[PDB]
Each structure stands twice: as C-alpha cells, then as structure tokens.
Amino acid sequence: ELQEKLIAVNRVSKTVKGGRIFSFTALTVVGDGNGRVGFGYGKAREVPAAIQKAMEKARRNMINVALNNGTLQHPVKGVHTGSRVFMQPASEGTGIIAGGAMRAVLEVAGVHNVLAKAYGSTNPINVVRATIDGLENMNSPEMVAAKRGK
Template identity: 30%
Template sequence: MGYDRRERKEVEWIPKTELGKKVKAGEVTDINTVLDKHIPIREQQITELLIPNLTVDFILVGQAKGKFGGGQRRIFRVSQKKTSEGNRPTFLTFAVVGNNDGIVGFGVGRAAETVPARNKAVENAKKNLLKIKRGCGSWECGCGEPHSIPYSVTGRCSSVTITLYPAPKGIGLCVTDECKKILKLAGIKDVWSRTTGKTSSRMNLIKALFDALKNLSKYHVQEKYASKIVDGVKR
C-alpha cells in the first residue's frame, strides 16, 4: 500500500510547560484546580487530558454569496488582500469548546486555508477556558438546581451590550441561535436576555456574551447563598 499524505500520524505528547509535566505525570487531575489558581494553559493537550468529554462547535460568523442576492451562513469569514500577485484570501473562524457542565472556552483562528484556521481556533479555545457560575436565581422558581445563572450579569463589546437574566426551569435559552451554542456547552439550560447595539455583528455579540460570562465570577456571594451556586464542574 502506498503512503497517504492525508493520514496524520499520532505523535506522543512531550510537555514543555511545568503544568503539562504535572498533568502527564498524574499530579494534577482536576481542571478546577488549574482554573482556581489562574494557571495559564499553554498546551491544548492539558485540556484534552483533564476534560476528555470536551465538545467542539463553531460559530457561523461568515456568509457565502447567494445566487440571487441571498447568502448562506458559514463558519468561515473570508477577507482578501490585494497584492502584486493577485488577491490573497484569509479565512477567520470562531470555535467554542465545553463539557456541558460549567466549563467553556472560545478561540479565534486565522490562516490562508480553511483547515489550518479551524485547527488554530480549536487549539486556542482549549487554551482559553472559563469556569461558569450556575444556580437558580429566578424568584419564580427557587428550585435550587444549577439550571440557570445565580444573578443577572452584563457584558459589552464595542457597541453591543448583552444582559443575561435568571429564568425559571422550563423557559429554555431565550437568546440567538449562536449564543445558544455557547450557553449549552457551558451547562446553562434556562436564561432570559436583552441586547442593544449593532447585534448583527456576530463577532461582537459573541465577545459580549463571553464578557458577561466572565463577569459572573467577579461578584462575591454571601455564605448563606453560596451553597446553592455551582462554580465550574459540579462535584
């Protein structure tokens, strides 16, 4: 049989960072320990070992030209630069990863071809993880289960502002389809939202949503309510 260049051989991971060496040696086995101490993740294999059930999804940030003026949404946004050799295209894509249980990450990838751009986005997303606080902050529910967020929170990016509100169980995710992908991967099942600004810019809307999720960890909760909030993976 001939050699197929498309087949990629699996190379044994040799960690280069101190955290990577501890993870491979089995000294660090919990992703919450890494995120609580704010240790930067420089290698994607660290996330793959600590969170084996990670799910990857892509945001539809681009649009293909339609035959009669309409267009179909794509995961790649194409930009071209004019050079002496002709037009040089660049592909941009936005990847989201999560375990559906309080951990979510996002990353952006750019390259001259689609596959390298997609791989870069996934790699960057695995290095940029967030712990999401979940709870039941709706006065209409009060079940105490981590199906929503514990309190309202706001995120901003450029002119876009998004505010997330706790919702009772059964309401679902009252956000756009692309924001639903992120909240589902974060383990949030019910939420209300309100957006202002130029929300047609999906990149700014997604970045504003992640800014809101980051702000969930900036608030301190009283001890009598802290027991009802799940921070990160539910133990």
C-alpha cells in the same frame, strides 16, 4: 468530554501587488458543559485548517463560571466594543432563548434555560466574549457570603 461548536467562517482579502489573496477566519466555542467555556478565533488559507487552529486556542483559554442549577445567578449585562448583552436566569422549564452565537456560547457553557437579548451591533466575534464578560463578572451567593455569614 468537551463539546465544540463553530459559529461562523468568513473570508478576508489582502490585495497584494500581484493580485488579491483570500484567507479564511473561523470562530469556535468549546466547553465542558458544566462550568467551563472558552472561545477561539483562528485564521488560515483554507477552511478546515482555520477551524482546527481555533479549537486549539479555545481549549487553552477556557474560563470558569458558577451556575445555580442550569441557569445564571442574577441578571447580568455584558458589553464589549459595540455589542451590549442582557441575560435573565428565568425558570427551569423554558428552554434556551438566545440569538446568534449566544445559543452556542450558553449551551456549551452549560445553561439549559435562560432568556437573552443582544443590543447594538450583532458581530459574532464581539457578541462572543461579550457574553463571556458577563459570565466572568457574575457574582455567586457563595462568594458573596464571604462578606459575612449568609
């Protein structure tokens, strides 16, 4: 069964003529724990509800990745907007070593051990999906062997 995790919940203001109205935005990541991971960004005027919305959207935007064992193939660089990401497969008995929301994304995607680092802005929203871009463009030996033989 899928597992879901909540990264952060924020508050945003609209300052209408009448006054100031506050809304809540939630970011969540869902995944099967083997190959499939997705993220959702929901909003609402109450917390519990925004979370719900997010989950729904995440489930419907899962993506697939190839994982040599519980680890990546090769080092990959992820970039989006203003957040750079770097990851290394590392050995097996090392645990997960990552920062804010990278632990969430990788654990949900099913990476039991990896070395990760974030450069530039650390904005949960960008860092999420910046990791996922790298996992997207990761190339596996099986799909690179389509060139010829092995």
